[PDB]
Amino acid sequence: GQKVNSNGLRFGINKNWISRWTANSHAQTAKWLIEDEKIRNLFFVNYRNAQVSNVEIERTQATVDVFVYAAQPAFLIGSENKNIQKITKQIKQIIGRTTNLDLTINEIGSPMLSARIIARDLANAIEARVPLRTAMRQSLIKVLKAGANGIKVLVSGRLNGAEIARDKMYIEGNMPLSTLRADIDYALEKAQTTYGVIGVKVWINRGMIYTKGLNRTPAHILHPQKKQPNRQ
Amino acid sequence: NAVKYPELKIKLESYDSTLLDLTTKKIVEVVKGVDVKIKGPLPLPTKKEVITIIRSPHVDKASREQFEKNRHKRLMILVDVNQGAIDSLKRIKIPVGVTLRFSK
Amino acid sequence: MRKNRAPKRTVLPDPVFNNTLVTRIINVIMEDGKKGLAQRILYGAFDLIEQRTKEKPLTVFERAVGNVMPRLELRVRRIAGSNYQVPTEVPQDRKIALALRWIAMFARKRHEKTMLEKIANEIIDASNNTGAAIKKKDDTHKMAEANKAFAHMRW
Amino acid sequence: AKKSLKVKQTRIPKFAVRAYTRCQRCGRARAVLSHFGVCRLCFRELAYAGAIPGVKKASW
Amino acid sequence: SRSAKKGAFVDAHLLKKVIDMNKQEKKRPIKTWSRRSTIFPEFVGNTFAVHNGKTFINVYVTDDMVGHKLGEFSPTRNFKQHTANR
Amino acid sequence: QSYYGLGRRKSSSAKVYLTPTQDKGKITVNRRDPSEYFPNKLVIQDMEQPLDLTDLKKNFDINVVVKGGGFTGQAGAIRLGIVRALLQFNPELKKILKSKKLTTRDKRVKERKKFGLYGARRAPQFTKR
RNA sequence: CUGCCGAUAAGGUCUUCAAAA
RNA sequence: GGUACACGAAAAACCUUACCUAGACUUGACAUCCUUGGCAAAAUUAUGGAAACAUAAUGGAGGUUAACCGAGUGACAGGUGGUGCAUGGUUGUCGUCAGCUCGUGUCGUGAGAUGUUGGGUUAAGUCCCGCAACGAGCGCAACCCUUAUCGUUAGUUACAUUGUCUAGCGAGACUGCUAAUGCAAAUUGGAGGAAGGAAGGGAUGACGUCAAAUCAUCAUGCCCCUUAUGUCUAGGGCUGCAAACGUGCUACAAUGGCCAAUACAAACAGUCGCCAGCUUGUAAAAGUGAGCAAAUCUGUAAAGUUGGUCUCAGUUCGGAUUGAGGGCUGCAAUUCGUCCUCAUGAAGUCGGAAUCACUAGUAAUCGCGAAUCAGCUAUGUCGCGGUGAAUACGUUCUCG
Numbered sequence A: 001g002q003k004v005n006s007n008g009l010r011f012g013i014n015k016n017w018i019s020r021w022t023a024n025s026h027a028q029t030a031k032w033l034i035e036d037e038k039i040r041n042l043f044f045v046n047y048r049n050a051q052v053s054n055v056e057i058e059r060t061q062a063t064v065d066v067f068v069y070a071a072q073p074a075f076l077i078g079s080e081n082k083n084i085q086k087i088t089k090q091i092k093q094i095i096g097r098t099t100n101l102d103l104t105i106n107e108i109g110s111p112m113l114s115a116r117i118i119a120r121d122l123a124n125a126i127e128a129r130v131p132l133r134t135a136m137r138q139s140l141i142k143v144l145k146a147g148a149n150g151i152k153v154l155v156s157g158r159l160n161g162a163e164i165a166r167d168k169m170y171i172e173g174n175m176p177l178s179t180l181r182a183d184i185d186y187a188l189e190k191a192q193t194t195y196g197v198i199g200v201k202v203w204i205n206r207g208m209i210y211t212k213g214l215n216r217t218p219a220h221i222l223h224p225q226k227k228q229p230n231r232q
Numbered sequence B: 001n002a003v004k005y006p007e008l009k010i011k012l013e014s015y016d017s018t019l020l021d022l023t024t025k026k027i028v029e030v031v032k033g034v035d036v037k038i039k040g041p042l043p044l045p046t047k048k049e050v051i052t053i054i055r056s057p058h059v060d061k062a063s064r065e066q067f068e069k070n071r072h073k074r075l076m077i078l079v080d081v082n083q084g085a086i087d088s089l090k091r092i093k094i095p096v097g098v099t100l101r102f103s104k
Numbered sequence C: 001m002r003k004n005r006a007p008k009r010t011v012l013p014d015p016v017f018n019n020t021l022v023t024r025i026i027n028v029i030m031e032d033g034k035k036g037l038a039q040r041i042l043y044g045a046f047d048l049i050e051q052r053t054k055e056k057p058l059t060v061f062e063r064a065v066g067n068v069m070p071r072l073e074l075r076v077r078r079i080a081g082s083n084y085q086v087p088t089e090v091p092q093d094r095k096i097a098l099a100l101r102w103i104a105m106f107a108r109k110r111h112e113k114t115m116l117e118k119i120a121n122e123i124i125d126a127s128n129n130t131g132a133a134i135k136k137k138d139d140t141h142k143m144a145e146a147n148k149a150f151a152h153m154r155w
Numbered sequence D: 001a002k003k004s005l006k007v008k009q010t011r012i013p014k015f016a017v018r019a020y021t022r023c024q025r026c027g028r029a030r031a032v033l034s035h036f037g038v039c040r041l042c043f044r045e046l047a048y049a050g051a052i053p054g055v056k057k058a059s060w
Numbered sequence E: 001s002r003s004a005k006k007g008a009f010v011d012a013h014l015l016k017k018v019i020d021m022n023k024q025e026k027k028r029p030i031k032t033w034s035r036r037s038t039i040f041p042e043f044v045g046n047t048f049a050v051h052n053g054k055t056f057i058n059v060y061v062t063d064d065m066v067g068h069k070l071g072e073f074s075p076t077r078n079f080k081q082h083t084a085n086r
Numbered sequence F: 001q002s003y004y005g006l007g008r009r010k011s012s013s014a015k016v017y018l019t020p021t022q023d024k025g026k027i028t029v030n031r032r033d034p035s036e037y038f039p040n041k042l043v044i045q046d047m048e049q050p051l052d053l054t055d056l057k058k059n060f061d062i063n064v065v066v067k068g069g070g071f072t073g074q075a076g077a078i079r080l081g082i083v084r085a086l087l088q089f090n091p092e093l094k095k096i097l098k099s100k101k102l103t104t105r106d107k108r109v110k111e112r113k114k115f116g117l118y119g120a121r122r123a124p125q126f127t128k129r
Numbered sequence G: 001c002u003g004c005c006g007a008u009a010a011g012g013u014c015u016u017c018a019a020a021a
Numbered sequence H: 001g002g003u004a005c006a007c008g009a010a011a012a013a014c015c016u017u018a019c020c021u022a023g024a025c026u027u028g029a030c031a032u033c034c035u036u037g038g039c040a041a042a043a044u045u046a047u048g049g050a051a052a053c054a055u056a057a058u059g060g061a062g063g064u065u066a067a068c069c070g071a072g073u074g075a076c077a078g079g080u081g082g083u084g085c086a087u088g089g090u091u092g093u094c095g096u097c098a099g100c101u102c103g104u105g106u107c108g109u110g111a112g113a114u115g116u117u118g119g120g121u122u123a124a125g126u127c128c129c130g131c132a133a134c135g136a137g138c139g140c141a142a143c144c145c146u147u148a149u150c151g152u153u154a155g156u157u158a159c160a161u162u163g164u165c166u167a168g169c170g171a172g173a174c175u176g177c178u179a180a181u182g183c184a185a186a187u188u189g190g191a192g193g194a195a196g197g198a199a200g201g202g203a204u205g206a207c208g209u210c211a212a213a214u215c216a217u218c219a220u221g222c223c224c225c226u227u228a229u230g231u232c233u234a235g236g237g238c239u240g241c242a243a244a245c246g247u248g249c250u251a252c253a254a255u256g257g258c259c260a261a262u263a264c265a266a267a268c269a270g271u272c273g274c275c276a277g278c279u280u281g282u283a284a285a286a287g288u289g290a291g292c293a294a295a296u297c298u299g300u301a302a303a304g305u306u307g308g309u310c311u312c313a314g315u316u317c318g319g320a321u322u323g324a325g326g327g328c329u330g331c332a333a334u335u336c337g338u339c340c341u342c343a344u345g346a347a348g349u350c351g352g353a354a355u356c357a358c359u360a361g362u363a364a365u366c367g368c369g370a371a372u373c374a375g376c377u378a379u380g381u382c383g384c385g386g387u388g389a390a391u392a393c394g395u396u397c398u399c400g
């Protein structure tokens, strides 16, 4: 049957919001809401070879702050800070010159156990004509070796160019979806294949959060260092 | 010694609760580190708005989920502040989520 | 298919004549969820009973309701064609309840005037074993007596 | 016929009563939440990702 | 229904043509798309071609038809007979 | 030596003040005569239900403040309020009062309306054919 | 504890594959 | 069909709008890429105009082209056009039912079996025993929210008849103690307790079935159109009407109709708004006009209590339909807005065969608020409180 979004079921209890701002009026609540979606989509659609895991947005009456986590930030940084200037101009055109931006790339730790880049890698493999069975298994084994709990991958679509759509799942371990205390990270991606669209869904279990609180604490960014800059 | 501001009525509101308590703890600690008689961090009723949205894309109006957004609210009135408190009030840095209604 | 027996809510002793049963009939004549209205209607009928019968209203009500109470109950049991009925002894709780339901049902159909006098007349007409509720009790009793043979087989 | 209606909605009409509100992410016209400027089926997607601060699931 | 202070309503394009057309003796049918214009006393004696949706139906206004709307004296849809289903 | 009790039922508070007196109880609700504050639809006995079977001759002066609810709900609040004040004068009374279950919050409140349903527990008419 | 109780247009998907990691 | 029919649509007069009739346009209303300049688009006033659009005007923020304003320019833009039987995504249904499988091992030539079936206990594949099975995953349960008692912090815009109330933290209920019987889980009773044995409600919905629903939220393979299936505007249409069905409202009445006085809520919402009071008006409302960015100000609570009257009538029931006069929104109320006042007074006196919902604050019923919204016979939808029942003996029949 149908299931409630795993990310959406855990918001406001154990998971913080990706955008944290309070608008002035119901007219300014819509502009500030579509614009941040454009920024997030920009980061995700293009600049994909970087493995951007999550982009957070922080806005005040007039000051915009962006916290961008990536696995390989060299591509964003570019050759002696070139590509970086380009993206700043991109961000300024979307929000406006009248405001103040404080974009912040922040390098990420433990990149494997994140459902976003795994789905992106999965989608790239399917688009690259890689056999589906082999592609998921290599991603599954590497993620488990990274030192996490069970992972559930559902890859539904016109499998292998077939005319009848199927779906292949591969769970390997305890994925307690009905439990609220668990840390389940979820992401979904659309692999654009020449024979249509492939939907990949990745459920990852990253332990149990036994410390009550609406997070305010990082998630799989702590193990190695996490810095770099571009801020003020 | 001076005041320059009688009856400084600080009002707090935010979508989140735990951050709101944290901001009141920080505000109270600084304002008591200076010589001000805090009346008290009282709680106000939280205005809750609820929006009902149909889950399905086309049919089956019966299956409709719900969402909520709580406006947690607090009140805090300062009797006498003076520069000694006001200058220290400049370095507070209130976490974005909390919203201030300073009424002088 | 249930295997559980339902609980029972309290009946409450009446607030005037201290005769529980008054509260039950109040709830029976209830319509539109008006507790107030029903009490007024019923209580007014006892006052009319005083003016007419010159006797204690609680005693008259018991003499009417106790006389209306049936003894046998006919439960429908179909096998192949129609239903052969089965007379069974009804419990004491259901005895009073069925009596009250019939009293109210024939009271809201009389040719009389305001239901105060309507309901007042039915109870006074039932204390002398000559009314509409009596006939209903008579009919079911005679039907059970006629169908005495199948009483042994119930299910 | 979607793109032309979206552009026309942004453009000011010649009568005040000629102005209607259409979702700002997609182009859906009916069932638009003025409190958020987002239609019912984009508000679900946005709410399930955490983009709107404070919109949590309800238990009542 | 319609308020008092507001009064009646014509598009004033129909009003201008009617003033011009009443002065000219050899009047001809006036092609108006305004079914919304109320018939004003000066309209009396002229003939109009109101757009029913498809064509322009000709209405000759009189001293009596005064007060209602110009589109009210023309139709828009047509129904004259059903057909046995079975 | 006064006694205080706080009852509640259907979102209706109660402030009952028990004052020792020997000149008739003079029941009083919100500074008004009980016969006028309530539809006097015989609801007055209910609140006094735990104050009757034990006694009211002790002439306890009652100072009731109720703010909220309808009228039966307010009546339910003061009975619990009367009982909660009664738990400070002669803790024996508690035992017998406990018996009749007159020392328990009724815990009964109106349910929330559910989507797709015409009420708390009702549901639309179902048509198969 | 044996009332009664009849029918249902044609042709159709769906396993691509282990060579292997 | 159940799982469509107050459904998409949480607002069809214009707009919406995807339809029809007409008047107009062609790298186009919107976009990028390219050679190339910016010394504008708007808005508004004129004339012709149904308005699209044209000819004339103030030639316009700015920042030297940033964004856009353009020229030239072909790739192209555009499609609510087809295919949900190509799909992604989302959802209904069995069903919150208790199931669905895997690893290793064993049996069988094999499909396959085992575990998952036996005996007890539950709402439960919940648990305990037995057991060629030993374990594991998803579901179940708990962790989350809310209501019920209390402690602590805080006391204004609540309270101020002094400890309500509001919202942060915490305590509390754990079959924890006892009696019975069972190996053990566990069942029943009692004690104390605000709460007793999933304390009430909500979120939470396994593999899968029905090629179930949606290309018309969005995205998308493929096919089709490309001075037209694309675009702008005016008018009509989505509101028809011999008919049938579904879901609701109002009734057929003295448990009531009308009139007067009058007591008691919770939740939510509000600066193009809520609108107090006052003046005018038979009334919808108008004018004046404070107060409130809100525990402060505003959004009249009704059923209910008492008094008067009707006296069972197609009526002082019932309000349909129709005519006239008014008020509000809006360019605009005829197609096709609703409200008030006056006038009229259809059917209908409990509804055939057959059917639907509901196990306590529930059914029934009375009001209040919000969403989309300039306005809307939303009587719809989502919420909040006031009053407040009857019954469950049992699984023989009935459906799953």
Ligand SMILES: [Mg+2]
Pocket: D002
């Ligand atoms: Mg579209």
Ligand SMILES: [Mg+2]
Pocket: G003, G004
């Ligand atoms: Mg037969």
Ligand SMILES: [Mg+2]
Pocket: H003
């Ligand atoms: Mg169906």
Ligand SMILES: [Mg+2]
Pocket: H017
């Ligand atoms: Mg239209």
Ligand SMILES: [Mg+2]
Pocket: H039
């Ligand atoms: Mg210039």
Ligand SMILES: [Mg+2]
Pocket: H038, H064, H065
């Ligand atoms: Mg230049």
Ligand SMILES: [Mg+2]
Pocket: none
């Ligand atoms: Mg298409």
Ligand SMILES: [Mg+2]
Pocket: H084, H211
């Ligand atoms: Mg399908």
Ligand SMILES: [Mg+2]
Pocket: H131
């Ligand atoms: Mg076995």
Ligand SMILES: [Mg+2]
Pocket: none
């Ligand atoms: Mg076993």
Ligand SMILES: [Mg+2]
Pocket: A178, H204
């Ligand atoms: Mg659960």
Ligand SMILES: [Mg+2]
Pocket: none
């Ligand atoms: Mg189909």
Ligand SMILES: [Mg+2]
Pocket: none
């Ligand atoms: Mg039109």
Ligand SMILES: [Mg+2]
Pocket: none
């Ligand atoms: Mg319609």
Ligand SMILES: [Mg+2]
Pocket: F118, H248
């Ligand atoms: Mg309804």
Ligand SMILES: [Mg+2]
Pocket: none
């Ligand atoms: Mg009367």
